[PDB]
Design a protein around this ligand. Sequence first.
Ligand SMILES: Nc1ncnc2c1ncn2[C@@H]1O[C@H](COP(=O)(O)OP(=O)(O)NP(=O)(O)O)[C@@H](O)[C@H]1O
Ligand SMILES: Nc1ncnc2c1ncn2[C@@H]1O[C@H](COP(=O)(O)OP(=O)(O)NP(=O)(O)O)[C@@H](O)[C@H]1O
Ligand SMILES: Cc1ncc(C[n+]2csc(CCOP(=O)(O)O)c2C)c(N)n1
Ligand SMILES: Cc1ncc(C[n+]2csc(CCOP(=O)(O)O)c2C)c(N)n1
Ligand SMILES: [Ca+2]
Ligand SMILES: [Ca+2]
Ligand SMILES: [Ca+2]
Ligand SMILES: [Ca+2]
Ligand SMILES: [Ca+2]
Ligand SMILES: [Ca+2]
Ligand SMILES: [Ca+2]
Ligand SMILES: [Ca+2]
Ligand SMILES: [Ca+2]
Ligand SMILES: [Ca+2]
Ligand SMILES: [Ca+2]
Ligand SMILES: [Ca+2]
Ligand SMILES: [Ca+2]
Ligand SMILES: [Ca+2]
Ligand SMILES: [Ca+2]
Ligand SMILES: [Ca+2]
Lengths: 304, 304
Amino acid sequence: FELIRRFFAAAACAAPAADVALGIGDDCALLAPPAGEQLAVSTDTLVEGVHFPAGCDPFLLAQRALAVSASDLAAMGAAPLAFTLALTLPQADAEWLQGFARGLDAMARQCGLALVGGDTTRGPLSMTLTVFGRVPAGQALTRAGARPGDLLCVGGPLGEAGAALELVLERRSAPAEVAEPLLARYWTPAPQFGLGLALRGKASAALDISDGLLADCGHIARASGVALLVECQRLQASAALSGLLAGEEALRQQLAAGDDYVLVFTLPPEYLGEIRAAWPAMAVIGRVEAGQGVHLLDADGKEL
Amino acid sequence: FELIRRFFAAAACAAPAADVALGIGDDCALLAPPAGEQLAVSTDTLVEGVHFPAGCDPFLLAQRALAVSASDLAAMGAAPLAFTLALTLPQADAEWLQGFARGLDAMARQCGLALVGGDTTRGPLSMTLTVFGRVPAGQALTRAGARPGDLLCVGGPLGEAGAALELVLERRSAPAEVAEPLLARYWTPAPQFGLGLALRGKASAALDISDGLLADCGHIARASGVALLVECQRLQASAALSGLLAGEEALRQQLAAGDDYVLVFTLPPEYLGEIRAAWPAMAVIGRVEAGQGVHLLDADGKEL
Ligand SMILES: Nc1ncnc2c1ncn2[C@@H]1O[C@H](COP(=O)(O)OP(=O)(O)NP(=O)(O)O)[C@@H](O)[C@H]1O
Ligand SMILES: Nc1ncnc2c1ncn2[C@@H]1O[C@H](COP(=O)(O)OP(=O)(O)NP(=O)(O)O)[C@@H](O)[C@H]1O
Ligand SMILES: Cc1ncc(C[n+]2csc(CCOP(=O)(O)O)c2C)c(N)n1
Ligand SMILES: Cc1ncc(C[n+]2csc(CCOP(=O)(O)O)c2C)c(N)n1
Ligand SMILES: [Ca+2]
Ligand SMILES: [Ca+2]
Ligand SMILES: [Ca+2]
Ligand SMILES: [Ca+2]
Ligand SMILES: [Ca+2]
Ligand SMILES: [Ca+2]
Ligand SMILES: [Ca+2]
Ligand SMILES: [Ca+2]
Ligand SMILES: [Ca+2]
Ligand SMILES: [Ca+2]
Ligand SMILES: [Ca+2]
Ligand SMILES: [Ca+2]
Ligand SMILES: [Ca+2]
Ligand SMILES: [Ca+2]
Ligand SMILES: [Ca+2]
Ligand SMILES: [Ca+2]
């Protein structure tokens, strides 16, 4: 118990914060959600050996856990507010917990997220973070509004965290300056809060890419009752990705690595200029048509 | 994925509900918290082999997980609103998930809790539930307000879930009619929502008993800067507990079993009649004095 007060109640991100009436210390936290906005709520579990490697640095792990969880707020166009941390520990290592809380502080500061509570238990290493944000009624980015003619877009480079995973698992090697930007996408992805806000009233549908580009395109296609067409030639590897992989290897990571935590969204053509101006890292990758399913097209428009 | 729609999106407790603008289906749920009240937020993890036995009936397990999590809302005097379910599964067994969702529905209905979202992952069996409730500002039951002279009270019989655990783990046996009420306290404890509401403006401090009576009395003693005195002679075993255990065995379970999910609270003497009238199952177990720590006293007032 005492390590909770020492490491988390005392953490910088657990300090008093706006819209938080009561933080760590009681049976519940108390939020005063801003009047006139809805509260966006999402929860994510990271499991040792599944979402991160055993033996990893806890300073990095805490940032990854909070970032991948906070990304679902950006996927709704919500502004960040607070979170809770449920932590399951095989043993209560003070030095591990110290590094974990240090990394949690760093990512929470960068995300504007107040730590208001949590839970600590014993067992195989796992953590579940529940994040809270605010969005005006009727302005949240949902998945069901895509229409034929909409552009299919992403908020940034794809495949970088999958390339990074090869390095993390020591299944591939790279020069240090190639590894560093890719490892940053795995351990410290940046939730695309600013893009989510910019897409309010403009994107017809949106979510974040967690499972993988093609898989997660499926949610828009199914919820909206349309076909999504991904154009292979529009999947250009970033400089960072290209430092490690080429051709088909890079393409496969873009299509199916997941862990990107960039938004995939459909956009009426009339808003392309506004979103390009507000978020130059966005890219058009395809289009929406009438029909069903997700379709990958080659340079000639033939299905793969 | 499809089992989520089949078993949880289709669950009765996931139906449209008041103050829920968006339930299951997107990257976040959207809550419309009632204006003029704070949102109580708590999260709990249950780990296989720690908080429930391997191989157990999922219909019972789902009720236990939600009830023990919802109890923290009662511990703040909050009225129930909604919850999310993060579930980690070693394998996706359709019959297990069906029973789990059936039990989740039953307990969620009895608790008035809408299922609005969650997360599903692979790994050693675990679940983290995050519960949401509402409480007027300034009326939540906190831990720091106890004063010397306050009565120390609990909301119901103690030790019953610890007695039950002996049966659950097959470390003890009992006639069926003795086992049934105790097993009900382990698998389906009733969060004391009505008591939490009745204690608004009356209890000086409160929390629920999860770790154990003496351990959890420590939180009030430390937060309030007082001594809590538990009177052994006031720890009378219930009929249900007495069906299985006697004397010291029953007392030890009352003091240290935990898993009671009844409230422990301090109460100004002038409110005893009101709380007895509203919640006849409550019991006075001791008193608050100036000083520090938790103290167990015998019939003669000597410390044990
Ligand atoms: N890993 C964690 N990170 C942040 N806050 C935490 C963490 N674990 C616990 N907390 C918070 O720190 C306090 C722990 O005190 P405790 O009395 O154990 O809370 P609780 O919610 O009543 N525990 P329980 O009902 O037994 O699950 C609570 O306010 C928790 O919300
Ligand atoms: N065990 C569960 N119980 C209840 N709802 C769940 C559960 N698992 C997932 N959900 C919800 O069902 C939907 C699952 O769709 P999905 O697109 O996978 O959501 P998500 O939150 O974007 N997934 P991810 O970002 O990869 O963690 C979401 O609305 C979840 O909140
Ligand atoms: C050590 C390690 N770290 C990361 C990964 C990548 N990874 C795990 S799960 C998942 C999909 C989303 O999770 P879920 O399916 O639970 O929704 C992805 C892209 C890995 N394979 N190994
Ligand atoms: C199979 C099984 N089911 C239940 C129990 C009882 N139990 C586990 S943890 C705990 C304290 C609160 O949890 P925590 O310490 O994680 O806060 C209690 C009372 C058990 N020992 N075994
Ligand atoms: Ca809690
Ligand atoms: Ca509690
Ligand atoms: Ca997830
Ligand atoms: Ca997520
Ligand atoms: Ca360098
Ligand atoms: Ca969305
Ligand atoms: Ca998944
Ligand atoms: Ca998906
Ligand atoms: Ca989510
Ligand atoms: Ca998502
Ligand atoms: Ca707990
Ligand atoms: Ca709890
Ligand atoms: Ca019977
Ligand atoms: Ca309380
Ligand atoms: Ca505990
Ligand atoms: Ca405790």
